[PDB]
Amino acid sequence: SIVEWKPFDIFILLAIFANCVALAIYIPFPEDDSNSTNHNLEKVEYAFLIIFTVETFLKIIYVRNGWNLLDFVIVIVGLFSVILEQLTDVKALRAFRVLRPLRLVSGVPSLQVVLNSIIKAMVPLLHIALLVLFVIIIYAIIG
Amino acid sequence: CRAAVKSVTFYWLVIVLVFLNTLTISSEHYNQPDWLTQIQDIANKVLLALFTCEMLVKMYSLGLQAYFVSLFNRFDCFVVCGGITETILVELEIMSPLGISVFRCVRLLRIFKVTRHWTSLSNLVASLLNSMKSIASLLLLLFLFIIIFSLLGMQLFG
Amino acid sequence: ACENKGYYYEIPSIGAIRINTQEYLDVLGRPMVLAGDKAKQVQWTNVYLD
Amino acid sequence: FVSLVIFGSFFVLNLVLGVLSGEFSKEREKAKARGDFQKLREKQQLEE
Amino acid sequence: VYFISFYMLCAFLIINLFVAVIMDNFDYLTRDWSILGPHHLDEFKRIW
Amino acid sequence: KDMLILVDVSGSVSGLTLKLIRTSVSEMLETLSDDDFVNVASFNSNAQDVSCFQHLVQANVRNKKVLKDAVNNITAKGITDYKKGFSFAFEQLLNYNVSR
Amino acid sequence: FRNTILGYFDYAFTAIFTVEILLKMTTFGNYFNLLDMLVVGVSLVSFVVKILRVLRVLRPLRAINRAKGLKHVVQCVFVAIRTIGNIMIVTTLLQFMFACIGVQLFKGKFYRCTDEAKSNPEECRGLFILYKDGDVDSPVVRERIWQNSDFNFDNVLSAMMALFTVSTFEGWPALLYKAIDSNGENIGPIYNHRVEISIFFIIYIIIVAFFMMNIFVGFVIV
Amino acid sequence: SSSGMIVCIYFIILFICGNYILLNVFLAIAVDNLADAESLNTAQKEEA
Amino acid sequence: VEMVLKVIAFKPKGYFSDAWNTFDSLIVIGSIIDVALSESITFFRLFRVMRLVKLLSRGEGIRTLLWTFIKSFQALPYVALLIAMLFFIYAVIGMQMFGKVAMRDNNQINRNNNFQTFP
Ligand SMILES: CCCCc1oc2ccccc2c1C(=O)c1cc(I)c(OCCN(CC)CC)c(I)c1
Numbered sequence: 001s002i003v004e005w006k007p008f009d010i011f012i013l014l015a016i017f018a019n020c021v022a023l024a025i026y027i028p029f030p031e032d033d034s035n036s037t038n039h040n041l042e043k044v045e046y047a048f049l050i051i052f053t054v055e056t057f058l059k060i061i062y063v064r065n066g067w068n069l070l071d072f073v074i075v076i077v078g079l080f081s082v083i084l085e086q087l088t089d090v091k092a093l094r095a096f097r098v099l100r101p102l103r104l105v106s107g108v109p110s111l112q113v114v115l116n117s118i119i120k121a122m123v124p125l126l127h128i129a130l131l132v133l134f135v136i137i138i139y140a141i142i143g
Numbered sequence: 144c145r146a147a148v149k150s151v152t153f154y155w156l157v158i159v160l161v162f163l164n165t166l167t168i169s170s171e172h173y174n175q176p177d178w179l180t181q182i183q184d185i186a187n188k189v190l191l192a193l194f195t196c197e198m199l200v201k202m203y204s205l206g207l208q209a210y211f212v213s214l215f216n217r218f219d220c221f222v223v224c225g226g227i228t229e230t231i232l233v234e235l236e237i238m239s240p241l242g243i244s245v246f247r248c249v250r251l252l253r254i255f256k257v258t259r260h261w262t263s264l265s266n267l268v269a270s271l272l273n274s275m276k277s278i279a280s281l282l283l284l285l286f287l288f289i290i291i292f293s294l295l296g297m298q299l300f301g
Numbered sequence: 302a303c304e305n306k307g308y309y310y311e312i313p314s315i316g317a318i319r320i321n322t323q324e325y326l327d328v329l330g331r332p333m334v335l336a337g338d339k340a341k342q343v344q345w346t347n348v349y350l351d
Numbered sequence: 352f353v354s355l356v357i358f359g360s361f362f363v364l365n366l367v368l369g370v371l372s373g374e375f376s377k378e379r380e381k382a383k384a385r386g387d388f389q390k391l392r393e394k395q396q397l398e399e
Numbered sequence: 400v401y402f403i404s405f406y407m408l409c410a411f412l413i414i415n416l417f418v419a420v421i422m423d424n425f426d427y428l429t430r431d432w433s434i435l436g437p438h439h440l441d442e443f444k445r446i447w
Numbered sequence: 448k449d450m451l452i453l454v455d456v457s458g459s460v461s462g463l464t465l466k467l468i469r470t471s472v473s474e475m476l477e478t479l480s481d482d483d484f485v486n487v488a489s490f491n492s493n494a495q496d497v498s499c500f501q502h503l504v505q506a507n508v509r510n511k512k513v514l515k516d517a518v519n520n521i522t523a524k525g526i527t528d529y530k531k532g533f534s535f536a537f538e539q540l541l542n543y544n545v546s547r
Numbered sequence: 548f549r550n551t552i553l554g555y556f557d558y559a560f561t562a563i564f565t566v567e568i569l570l571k572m573t574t575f576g577n578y579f580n581l582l583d584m585l586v587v588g589v590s591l592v593s594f595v596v597k598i599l600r601v602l603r604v605l606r607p608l609r610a611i612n613r614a615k616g617l618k619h620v621v622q623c624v625f626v627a628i629r630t631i632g633n634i635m636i637v638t639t640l641l642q643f644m645f646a647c648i649g650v651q652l653f654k655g656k657f658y659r660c661t662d663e664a665k666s667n668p669e670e671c672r673g674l675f676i677l678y679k680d681g682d683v684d685s686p687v688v689r690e691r692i693w694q695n696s697d698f699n700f701d702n703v704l705s706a707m708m709a710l711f712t713v714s715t716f717e718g719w720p721a722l723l724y725k726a727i728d729s730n731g732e733n734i735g736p737i738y739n740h741r742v743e744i745s746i747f748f749i750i751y752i753i754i755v756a757f758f759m760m761n762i763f764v765g766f767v768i769v
Numbered sequence: 770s771s772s773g774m775i776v777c778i779y780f781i782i783l784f785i786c787g788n789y790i791l792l793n794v795f796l797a798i799a800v801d802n803l804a805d806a807e808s809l810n811t812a813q814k815e816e817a
Numbered sequence: 818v819e820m821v822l823k824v825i826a827f828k829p830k831g832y833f834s835d836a837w838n839t840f841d842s843l844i845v846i847g848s849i850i851d852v853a854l855s856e857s858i859t860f861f862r863l864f865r866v867m868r869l870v871k872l873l874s875r876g877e878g879i880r881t882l883l884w885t886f887i888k889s890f891q892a893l894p895y896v897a898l899l900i901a902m903l904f905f906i907y908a909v910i911g912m913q914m915f916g917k918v919a920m921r922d923n924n925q926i927n928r929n930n931n932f933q934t935f936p
C-alpha cells in the first residue's frame with residue numbers, strides 16, 4: 001500500500017481506457033456470426049477481467065463508497081458471466097461491461113465533481129418531472 | 144517609418160483585400176465556367192503576393208518580437224505559410240487531388256483579421272477562452288455519456 | 302477469382318441480379334474463341350415454344 | 352393534440368428552463384461572495 | 400423566404416415570451432428558501 | 448459445364464442480402480440446360496448440401512425445381528468457414544461415381 | 548357567394564376609415580399615421596392585383612398605435628432585437644464559412660440516378676424495370692432520371708439553405724447519410740463511402756446549434 | 770407483441786437523461802461566462 | 818354519497834367558498850347522468866377524469882408553481898397577442914399565396930395539411 005500511491009491509480013486508469021477502446025473495436029455481427037478480431041478480443045476481455053478481480057481482491061486488504069460498490073458489482077458480474085459461459089441469455093448478460101467507462105469518472109475528480117454538481121442540480125426539477133408524469137397519465141387516460 | 148502602415152488608408156486597403164479574397168473563395172459553384180476558374184487562380188496568386196508583400200513590409204517596420212505576443216499575428220503567419228505551401232504544391236510536381244479543397248478552407252479564415260477589431264464582443268471571447276478548463280470538463284462528461292450509451296446500444300441492437 | 306481463372310461480380314440490389322448472373326458466360330467462352338474454326342459447329346436445341 | 356403540444360412541452364419547457372436559469376443565477380449570487388469575478392476583473396484590468 | 404422568415408420570427412417571439420414569463424417570476428425562481436419564504440406567512444395566516 | 452454453387456449462409460448475410468442471394472441463385476439456375484450438371488451447397492462453420500441430391504445432377508426441369516425450392520428454405524446463422532466450404536465444393540467435383 | 552358578401556363588407560370599412568382619416572387630419576391639420584393612410588390608400592386603388600391583395604394584410608398592423616400595451620411590447624421587442632445583433636453577425640459569419648467549406652466538400656456530389664444501378668449520367672438514361680416493394684414477381688417499367696438532392700451544396704446559397712435546415716434539426720440525418728455516400732464530382736453514391744465526413748456535420752451542429760444558439764437565449768435572459 | 774417493448778425505455782432514458790445533460794452543459798457556458806462578460810463590461814465602463 | 822355527506826356538515830352556502838370544493842360539486846351529477854345514458858355520452862365520461870389532478874395537486878411545491886406561472890401568464894397577455902398577430906398575418910399570406918396548390922395523398926400538402934382555409 002506504500003508504493004500504490006502514484007502508479008496504481010494511473011495503471012487502473014490506463015486499464016479502464018484500454019478496456020473501453022477494446023469494447024469500441026468490437027463488431028457485433030448478426031445471427032451469432034464472428035471473425036478473428038472478436039476471437040482475440042474475447043481473450044483480451046479475459047485478461048482484463050483477471051486484472052480487475054485481482055485489483056478488487058487486493059483493494060480490500062471497500063463497500064461504503066458507491067464507486068467501489070459499482071466496481072465490485074461489475075467484477076462479480078463478469079465472473080458470473082465467465083463461469084456461466086465456461087460451464088454451459090448466455091451473451092445477454094454481456095451488457096454489464098459497458099459500466100467500465102463509467103468508473104473512469106471516479107478516477108477523475110474533476111469529471112466527478114462536475115457530475116456531482118449536475119446530479120445535485122436535478123433536485124428542483126423533480127416537481128416538474130412529477131407534473132409531466134401526471135399530465136402524461138391524464139392524457140393517456142383521455143386517449 | 145510606421146505612421147503609414149497604421150493609417151486608415153492601410154486599414155481600408157486590407158479590408159478591400161480581404162473582401163476580394165472572400166469573394167474569390169465564395170464564387171465557386173458546380174459546373175462553373177472555365178474563365179471563372181482562370182480568374183480565380185489569377186486572383187489567388189495576386190492576393191497571395193500582395194499579402195506576402197504586406198506581411199514583409201509590416202515585419203520590417205513594426206518588430207518581430209511584438210508579433211508572437213498576440214495570438215492574431217501567429218495565426219496570420221500560419222495562414223500565409225499554408226497559402227504559399229498550397230500554391231507551390233499546386234504548381235509543383237504534385238497533383239494533390241483531395242488537398243485542393245482542404246487548403247481553400249485554410250485561406251478562408253481571413254475574415255478574422257477584420258473581426259478582431261470588434262472590441263465590443265471581445266468580452267465574451269475572453270471569458271470563454273479563460274473558462275476553457277470548465278468547458279473541456281463538461282464537454283468530456285457529455286462525450287463519456289455518449290460513448291457509454293453508444294456501447295450499450297451496440298450490445299442491445301447490434 | 303483472379304488467382305483461379307475466374308471473374309468477380311457485384312450485386313448490390315435486385316436490379317443488378319438479372320444482368321450479373323449471365324455475364325459469367327463471357328469468361329467460359331474464352332477457350333472456345335481461341336480454338337477458332339474447330340469451335341464452329343451447328344448445335345440444335347431442345348423443343349421449346351417460340 | 353394541439354392542447355397536448357402546448358401544455359405538454361411548451362409549458363413544461365418554460366418551467367424547466369425557468370428553474371435551471373434561476374438555479375444557475377442562484378449560483379451566481381453564491382459565487383459572488385467569494386469574489387471569482389474579481390479575479391477575472393483583476394486579470395483583465397492589467398491587460399489594457 | 401416565407402418559411403425561413405416565419406421560422407426565425409416565430410422562434411424569436413417564442414423565446415421572447417418564455418424569457419418574459421421567466422423574468423416575471425424571478426423572485427420565486429431565486430427564492431432561496433434556506434432563509435425565508437412566503438410559506439411561513441401562509442402558515443402564520445392559517446394559524447391565525 | 449459442371450457448376451457447383453457455394454452459398455454463404457453465415458450470420459452476416461441475414462436480412463436483405465439473404466433474399467438477394469436466394470433470388471440471385473434462382474436466376475443463375477435459369478442459365479443451365481439438360482447438358483449441364485449442377486448442385487447447390489451452403490457453408491456456415493460447416494458445409495452441407497441444401498437439397499437431397501448429395502452430388503451433381505442433370506439440371507433438367509424436375510431437378511432445377513427441387514434446387515430452387517430448397518434454396519428458398521435456407522436461413523442465415525453461424526460463423527463463416529471458407530476452408531470448410533471450398534473443400535466440400537472441390538471434393539464434389541472429383542466424385543466421378545456418377546454421370547457428369 | 549361568400550367572397551361577394553365579404554366584398555360588400557370591405558366597402559363599408561373603407562368608407563368608415565376614410566371618414567376617420569379626414570376628421571383626424573382636420574383637427575390635426577407621425578409615421579404611424581402614414582401606415583393608417585397606407586392601409587386605406589391601397590384599398591381605394593382596388594375596388595397586378597395579387598400584389599395589392601397580399602399587401603392589404605396590413606390591416607391589423609395599425610392596431611399597435613391604438614393600444615399602449617401593444618406599442619410597449621413592440622418597442623420592447625425592437626429593443627431586444629437591437630441589442631442582439633452582435634451575436635447574429637457572428638452566427639451568420641460562421642454559418643457562411645461553414646457553407647463555403649461544404650461547397651468545397653460536396654460540390655455536385657449529391658447527384659444520383661432513379662435506379663441504384665447506374666453510377667453516372669452517361670448511362671442513367673432510358674427506361675428501367677422497377678420491382679415494387681422489392682418483390683421480384685411484381686415488376687414495373689419506370690424512367691430513370693439523373694436527379695439532384697433538394698438540399699445540396701452546389702453553390703454558396705444552396706449550402707447556406709442546407710445548413711440552415713440542418714441547424715433547425717429537421718431532416719439532418721438524411722443530409723448526413725447523403726454526404727456520407729458522396730463519392731465524386733459527377734458519379735452516384737457509394738454505401739458508407741466516407742463515414743469520416745460526418746465530422747463536418749457534427750462540428751457544425753455542436754458549434755452553431757448547441758453552442759451559439761444557447762448563447763443567444765442566455766444573453767437574452769441576462 | 771411479447772416482451773420486446775420493454776426495450777423502449779432505453780430510448781426514453783437516452784432522450785430524457787441525454788437532453789438534461791445537454792441542457793446543463795451548453796447552458797452553463799452561456800449563463801456563467803456570459804453574465805460575467807456583462808459584469809466585466811460594466812466594470813470596464815466604470816473606468817472608461 | 819360523499820357530496821351530500823360533505824354538504825350536510827358544510828352547508829350549501831359555504832360550498833362555493835372554496836375553489837377546490839366546487840370542483841367536486843360539478844362532477845358527480847355528470848357521473849349520475851352517464852350511468853343512465855349508458856344503457857353527448859362521452860362528455861361527462863371524459864370530464865370525470867379531472868378528479869385526479871383536482872385532489873392530487875394539493876401539494877406545496879407543484880400547486881404554487883402552477884399558480885405563479887399562470888399568474889405570470891395572465892400578467893403578460895400582450896406577447897401572446899404578438900404571437901397571435903404573427904400567426905394571423907402569415908396564415909393570411911399563405912392562404913393568398915399557396916392556397917391554390919392541390920392536395921395529393923402522397924405529398925406534404927395533403928387533406929390534413931393545406932392552406933385552403935384559415936384554421
Ligand atoms: C426577429 C427576427 C430575427 C431572428 C433571428 O435572427 C438570427 C440570426 C442568426 C442566428 C439566429 C437568429 C434568430 C433567432 O431568433 C433563432 C434562430 C434559430 I435557427 C433558433 O433555433 C431553432 C431550433 N433549435 C432547436 C431545434 C436549434 C438550436 C432559435 I432558438 C432562434
Ligand SMILES: *[C@@H]1O[C@H](CO)[C@@H](O[C@@H]2O[C@H](CO)[C@@H](O)[C@H](O)[C@H]2NC(C)=O)[C@H](O)[C@H]1NC(C)=O
Pocket residue numbers: 542543544
Ligand atoms: C466412387 O467414389 C468413391 C468415393 O466417393 C470412391 O471411393 C471408394 O468408395 C467405395 C464405396 O463407396 C469403396 O470402394 C471404398 O470405400 C472407396 N475406396 C476405394 C479404393 O474403393 C470409389 O472408388 C468410386 N468408385 C466406385 C466404383 O465406387
Ligand SMILES: [Ca+2]
Pocket residue numbers: 033457458459460526527
Ligand atoms: Ca459471414
